[PDB]
DNA sequence: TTCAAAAGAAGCGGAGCTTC
């Protein structure tokens, strides 16, 4: 009540009365804000914050005495402090340029003098600073305070906001540009994840200067103010920093690529710093001085990263006691720089590391346009890894004189899909490069013998790092494979790392012997593992040699397993005990483990089953169409493109088609996840269309080694064994590209038929600039749509199995639908607010609800279970950040322009994402989850999802733990989870209170196609409720199953390697059974238990 | 309709329709 007088005495001058009944210019700062209970931000209260800063940062004693810390951080050192001073400097041309713009604004329009005479402009998308300025004679001008200390915010994010952006992918460019996923041009994706979208680069900037101002939102201001304030704050040092070109503005103009999308959208890209410069040592110094509690900073030592309360981007959501558990667990962690991988590094050199694991010099006419652009991207890629590795190699360097012995731990946090995400976008969890060079793995092995467990750990972390398979075969037949490796081909790059680890020196051909000796097997893990086994042979101490080489437990095809373990409902089928052997869990065979497996049983895993699924159905798709002699000269052209380009389909001269496990890897996986067809057949056509814009420059880099060379030969020469040989693929090539671009499949009434496009592809081809666009992407994806996809679904379907399908749909219509009638709701309940606010003459429309009408709309909806809970997860499916619950802007900048979205914490609707969010969640999420927080946890192991790096003295016990871990986690029942809040929304939902978009949107979901058009409520609401009939009956499948699965002995080795397989000791023996006998006894079991429930 | 985060700009006027 008092907090009134409080944040008017830190701020007695600005402009209006702190008080919303009030007649005059109104401050709504003052009414949005108050002073916190303890201090936030110690520039609050400061009369000049950029001298108050600049002078803390000006020498390490007057920082520590700032700050009140008796020691800083060592890397605020004299060169650094020299960086800062110089930025101190700047800061004040942005606050310089921030002054200039305000005073255009109160000139134009005569702004400043209506606001003088009452005109409300304080309230307008444009005038919302005026709330924080003070009258100065005939005009105003900006209060000092809050104008500085947001300087120094737009400073702090001007330094590390690129190092914190989200990774974007296509579906998200997809979503901001308004294209279609399967037609974006070459390398608009990348446009797009190397700049910010408005939105991201104010909402980033908001939040950084909200926070730094170290005030409390008022929970009964209008959000209008206390997110708008700082947004109009966020808004004009953007559009300052674009003056002063620390960032640069590029307004992406959709109409040059899609001739009828009118979206014209801005990128916002900050001017990097060289790579040099002394501030990326240490580019937190302004955070760490003007936060109390600082986010942004690196934890050295015993200095532990806090536990967030909170699911990442879902503050609706805590995060269980089991998960903060877990996310402790992996905070404590101590990460290691491993010094010669560092060294490597640098010796090596940017520009070889480029040239080595990325696409090195790019001459851009011997490069295809498109080609020349993923390779710009692969670039990218490993050069802002090589730059943020060695700027955090730069701050560990000035903490201690031995960079390997100071402790780095890593703050995470749980995401929407319960998984533990390290922050940040370059870390161990995230980049490759850095996972070989910061490593928690550390081990000391007697590697003195070499017929010792030490050795045989060691050999299988080699082996692993150089791409053996090593799940695949025994220890024993690995061991003879590694060495088989390193005593032939990898033999000269050994002898090279010998080298380096004795002079510290690398020939200039060091590239070549590298990338010739790894071929296929080239990665930064690889590099690891020649690296230490070099290391090994010069050891002086072999009985004692430390090293951080890791075995990583890996889930066997993760995803699709987890899923027939966890939703898979009926009676068990011999096809889905063979099916689910092939991901590590056997029955009736104590001990057995992966490597066991797949050398004496069973070779295909779920990915190669599924392949030779597809080719059945491929083959039966032939039979009836058998005389259709267009339509198979059509299936033929494909399978000779895909032939063509792709390493894994092959067609043989006797027309033979071989498929390898590879092609169905991405579509099992994200086709569990709800994934469609025709996303499936674009990725592929993708694939497709990568290789050929590729082999267009080979022909560019053959034309100018020999103008001489055939056009065949140039496109073909490495793919064939003579002149005319080469021919002919030319001939496959223009053949394959003319008919699948002019002749498309189209269904109809059940039946395939061939329709002309009348844009079939014409003309000479020109390797530089060659493109496959538009109408004929469309074409070549229609083609691989019905005739390679929709074979490849029916074979994934029938290899994961029906039942699996069938509980996935159901999860995914009912977790719709519940999203439906909360987003819905929540619309209606904030449009009623809206209305009553229309009479409140305090009121302007713009200003939208305060947070404490909008928590009490959320909480009205807690008797529709927005959550679901398993006991150790809560999910919040529907949980989203969006715009079209205000429809409205925010704020803008005082030119008018970079106008934000209010957007608002909102239910909306779930689509599929129900699917990957239980499986994902209660699956690899639950797993690790678990094996963090167990009895006997690992330490010191790197977990990244569905697999765990562990160091080579606890391969073993670690494995053990994570297929026990695997075993609590397939206790779970996801569908019974969604069963519990779905029929609690059952009982409160009123379909009738829908309106007819949200009734029409519960329809798709719930009725059949027919039934769609003209349904009554009490129609769609039977509908609904039969769902959660069928979800009931699941659920109580799922539950049997699982408990019938554990009376039986069990060996489970999902998270395969080393193996080391986890036992149930179920005392039901099930050996010497064929999986048809044992299906039958399952069965008896289910049967049994079935009727252990009704009496 | 795969998940892990959203996301057009800008004149005139003072919101929100409008044209690109």
Same mark, same amino acid.
């Given at each position: ?23 005059? =210019? ?52 004299? &060169? ?13 041309? =942005? ?72 990774? +974007? ?66 808004? &004009? ?27 014209? =959208? ?28 600082? #986010? ?33 667990? $992996? ?23 480029? &040239? ?54 890593? *703050? ?28 928690? #793995? ?83 893990? *690889? ?161 497709? #269309? ?58 109809? +009434?059940?039946?395939? $038929? ?24 469309? *074409? ?32 995914? +219509? ?30 302007? +429309? ?68 129900? =699917? ?24 010191? #192991? ?15 016990? *670690?494995?053990?733990?994570?297929? $026990? ?110 999986? $048809? ?19």
């Amino acid at each position: 009540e008092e907090l009134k007088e409080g944040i008017d005495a830190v701020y007695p001058s600005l402009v209006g009365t702190a008080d919303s009944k009030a007649e005059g =210019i109104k401050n709504y700062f003052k009414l949005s804000f108050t002073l916190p209970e303890e201090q936030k931000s110690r520039t609050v209260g400061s009369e000049a914050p950029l001298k108050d800063v600049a002078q803390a940062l000006s020498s390490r004693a007057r920082y520590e005495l700032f700050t009140e810390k008796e020691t800083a951080n060592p890397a605020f050192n004299g &060169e650094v402090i020299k960086r800062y001073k110089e930025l101190m400097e700047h800061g004040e041309g =942005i606050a310089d340029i921030l002054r200039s713009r305000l005073a255009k604004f109160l000139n134009t329009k005569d702004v400043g003098k209506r606001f003088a005479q009452g005109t409300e402009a304080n309230r307008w998308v444009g005038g919302k600073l005026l709330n924080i300025v003070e009258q100065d004679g005939d005009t105003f001008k900006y209060n000092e305070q809050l104008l500085q200390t947001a300087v120094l915010a737009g400073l702090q994010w001007r330094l590390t906001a690129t190092s914190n952006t989200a990774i +974007k992918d296509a579906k998200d460019v997809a979503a901001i540009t308004g294209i279609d996923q399967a037609l974006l041009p070459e390398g608009l994706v990348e446009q797009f994840d190397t700049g910010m979208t408005l939105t991201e680069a104010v909402s980033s900037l908001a939040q950084k200067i909200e926070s730094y101002w170290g005030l409390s939102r008022n929970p009964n201001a209008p959000l209008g103010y206390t997110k708008g304030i700082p947004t109009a704050m966020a808004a &004009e040092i953007l559009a300052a920093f674009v003056e002063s070109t620390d960032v640069v503005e590029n307004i992406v103009d959709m109409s040059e690529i899609d001739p009828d999308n009118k979206k014209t =959208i801005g990128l916002y890209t900050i001017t990097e710093l060289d790579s040099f410069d002394p501030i990326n040592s240490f580019p937190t110094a302004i955070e760490e001085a003007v936060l109390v509690n600082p #986010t942004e900073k690196m934890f050295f030592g015993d200095d532990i990263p806090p536990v967030a309360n909170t699911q990442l981007r879902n503050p609706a959501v805590r995060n269980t006691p089991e998960q903060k558990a877990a996310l402790k667990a $992996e905070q404590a962690t101590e990460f290691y720089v491993h010094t010669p991988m560092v060294q490597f590094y640098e010796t090596l050199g940017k520009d070889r590391i480029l &040239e080595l694991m990325g696409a090195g010099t790019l001459n851009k006419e011997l490069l295809n346009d498109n080609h020349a652009k993923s390779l710009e991207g692969k670039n990218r890629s490993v050069e802002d890894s090589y730059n943020q590795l060695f700027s955090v190699i730069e701050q560990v360097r000035a903490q201690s004189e031995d960079i390997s012995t100071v402790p780095i731990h890593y *703050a995470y946090n749980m995401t929407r899909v319960g998984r533990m995400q390290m922050l940040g976008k370059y870390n161990p969890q995230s980049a490759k490069l850095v996972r070989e060079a910061i490593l928690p #793995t550390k081990a000391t092995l007697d590697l003195s013998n070499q017929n010792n467990e030490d050795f045989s750990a060691f050999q299988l972390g080699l082996a692993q790092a150089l791409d053996i398979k090593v799940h695949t075969m025994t220890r024993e037949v690995m061991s003879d494979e590694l060495t088989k490796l390193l005593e032939g081909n990898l033999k000269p790059a050994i002898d090279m790392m010998v080298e380096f680890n004795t002079t510290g020196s690398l020939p200039e051909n060091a590239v070549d012997v590298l990338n010739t000796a790894l071929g296929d097997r080239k990665s930064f893990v *690889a590099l690891m593992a020649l690296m230490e086994y070099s290391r090994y042979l010069v050891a002086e101490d072999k009985s004692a040699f430390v090293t951080p080489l890791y075995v990583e437990a890996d889930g066997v095809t993760n995803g699709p397993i987890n899923a027939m373990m966890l939703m898979t409902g009926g009676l068990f089928t011999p096809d889905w005990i063979r099916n689910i052997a092939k991901g590590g869990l056997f029955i009736g065979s104590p001990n057995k483990t992966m490597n066991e497996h797949r050398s004496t049983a069973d070779n295909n895993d779920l990915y190669q089953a599924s392949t030779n699924a597809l080719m059945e159905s491929l083959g039966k798709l032939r039979s009836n169409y058998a005389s259709n002699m267009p339509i198979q000269s059509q299936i033929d052209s494909l399978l000779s493109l895909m032939d063509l380009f792709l390493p894994d389909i092959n067609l043989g001269e006797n027309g033979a088609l071989e498929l390898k496990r590879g092609i169905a890897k991405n579509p099992l996986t994200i086709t569990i996840y709800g994934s469609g067809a025709r996303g499936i057949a674009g990725k592929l056509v993708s694939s497709v #269309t990568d290789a050929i814009y590729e082999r267009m420059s080979d022909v560019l880099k053959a034309r100018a080694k020999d103008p001489n060379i055939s056009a065949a030969m140039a496109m073909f020469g490495k793919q064939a064994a003579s002149e005319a040989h080469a021919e002919e693929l030319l001939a496959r090539f223009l053949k394959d590209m003319e008919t699948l671009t002019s002749t498309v499949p189209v269904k109809r +009434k059940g039946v395939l $038929e061939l329709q002309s496009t009348g844009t079939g592809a014409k003309g000479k081809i020109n390797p530089k600039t060659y493109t496959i666009k538009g109408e004929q992407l469309k *074409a070549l994806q229609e083609n691989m749509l019905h005739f390679f996809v929709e074979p490849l679904r029916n074979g994934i379907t029938q290899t994961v199995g029906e039942s699996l399908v069938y509980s996935t749909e159901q999860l995914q +219509k009912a977790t719709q639908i519940q999203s439906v009638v909360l987003e819905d709701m929540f619309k209606q309940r904030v449009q009623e607010k809206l209305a009553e606010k229309a009479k409140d003459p305090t009121w302007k +429309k713009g200003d939208f609800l305060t947070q404490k009408e909008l928590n009490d709309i959320q909480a009205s909806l807690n008797n529709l279970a927005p959550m679901i809970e398993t006991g150790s997860q809560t999910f919040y499916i529907a949980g989203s950040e969006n715009a079209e619950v205000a429809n409205q802007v925010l704020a803008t900048n005082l030119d008018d322009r970079m106008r934000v979205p209010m957007s608002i914490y909102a239910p909306a609707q779930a689509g599929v994402a129900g =699917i990957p969010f239980m499986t994902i969640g209660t699956g690899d999420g639950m797993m690790m989850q678990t094996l963090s927080t167990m009895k006997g946890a690992p330490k010191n #192991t790197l977990k990244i999802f569905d697999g765990m790096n562990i160091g080579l003295n606890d391969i073993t016990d *670690a494995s053990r733990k994570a297929n $026990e871990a695997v075993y609590t986690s397939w206790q779970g029942n996801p569908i019974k989870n969604v069963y519990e809040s779905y029929a609690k929304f059952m009982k409160n939902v009123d379909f009738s209170k829908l309106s007819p978009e949200a009734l029409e949107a519960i329809g798709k979901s719930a009725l059949e196609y027919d039934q769609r058009e003209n349904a009554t409520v009490d129609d769609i609401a039977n509908a609904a409720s039969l769902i959660e009939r069928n979800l009931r009956n699941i659920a109580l499948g799922v539950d049997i199953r699982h408990k019938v699965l554990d009376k039986v002995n069990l060996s489970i080795d999902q998270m395969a390697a080393v193996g080391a397989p986890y036992q149930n000791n179920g005392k039901i023996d099930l050996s010497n059974m064929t999986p $048809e006998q044992q299906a039958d006894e399952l069965n008896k079991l289910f049967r049994e238990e079935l009727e252990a429930r009704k009496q």
